[PDB]
Amino acid sequence: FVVPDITTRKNVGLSHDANDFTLPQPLDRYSAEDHATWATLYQRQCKLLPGRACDEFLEGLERLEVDADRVPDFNKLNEKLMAATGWKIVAVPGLIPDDVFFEHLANRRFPVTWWLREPHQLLQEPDVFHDLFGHVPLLINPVFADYLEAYGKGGVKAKALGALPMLARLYWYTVEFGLINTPAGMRIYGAGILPSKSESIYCLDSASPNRVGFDLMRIMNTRYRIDTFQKTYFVIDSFKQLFDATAPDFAPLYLQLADAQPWGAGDIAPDDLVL
Numbered sequence: 001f002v003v004p005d006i007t008t009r010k011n012v013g014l015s016h017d018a019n020d021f022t023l024p025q026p027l028d029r030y031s032a033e034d035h036a037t038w039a040t041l042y043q044r045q046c047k048l049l050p051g052r053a054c055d056e057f058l059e060g061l062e063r064l065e066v067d068a069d070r071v072p073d074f075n076k077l078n079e080k081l082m083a084a085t086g087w088k089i090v091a092v093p094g095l096i097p098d099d100v101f102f103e104h105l106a107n108r109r110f111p112v113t114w115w116l117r118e119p120h121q122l123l124q125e126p127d128v129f130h131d132l133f134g135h136v137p138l139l140i141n142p143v144f145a146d147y148l149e150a151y152g153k154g155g156v157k158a159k160a161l162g163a164l165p166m167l168a169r170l171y172w173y174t175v176e177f178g179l180i181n182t183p184a185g186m187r188i189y190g191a192g193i194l195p196s197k198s199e200s201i202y203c204l205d206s207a208s209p210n211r212v213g214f215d216l217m218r219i220m221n222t223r224y225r226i227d228t229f230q231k232t233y234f235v236i237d238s239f240k241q242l243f244d245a246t247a248p249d250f251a252p253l254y255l256q257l258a259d260a261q262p263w264g265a266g267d268i269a270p271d272d273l274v275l
């Protein structure tokens, strides 16, 4: 049997723009159970993350006043975020079209899935805990925020050249699953890792995954999988290094990559700096 997925179930009776796919955050749809689920996830992660999350992330939670005991009011958070870096979050029903996503980032709007996972499934699909808790705190960092805006603006060129998957790989291996080295050890900045109960341990503690120095061409030539822990994590030295490394013209890189065989998710390339 085919049954409606969680995105369809959660958005019953609600609407989305056919242009920018936003809706006002439906505060009335959050149950007591949702706020409790948020509180449980928030508590779990805030216990686990010290000494694992990069310090900028944990500071962002505090400076944005991300609620510990309820699903945050997006408008209230936006007061703090707009003052910091001129960004705002917008509510979306779930996954949105790539062009809309890029257009949002290009305009300093970060799309956040409004609804929350059920306590039964504390998942695959992005929810508000992943999108808000995982992605938003680093937007208070001006270099990271500029990186996301630049990434957004880059969507037009990528789409024109049939290279959106190459940009998607870059996003995945930085914004979603990135690690950052520090003198105190490796830390986490990827939004896919920070909300997780188990990958946050594995990515720093396990001998299994490869930890490879960031390399733009390598990353855009590297496949990924969505339903398993990462076999490779890419490591930056700073958000500045990441912004600068991604500032050159990607057009000739895309054309060269278009004609190449990509690395598998678990491969170590000949030129990898393995850490």
Ligand SMILES: N[C@@H](Cc1ccccc1)C(=O)O
Binding pocket: 147, 150, 151, 153, 154, 157, 158, 170, 246, 247, 248, 249, 250, 251
């Ligand atoms: N430099 C890229 C744009 C981009 C910036 C930052 C991240 C990703 C892409 C281009 O020429 O299109």
Ligand SMILES: [Co+2]
Binding pocket: 126, 130, 131, 135, 176, 191, 192
């Ligand atoms: Co994400």
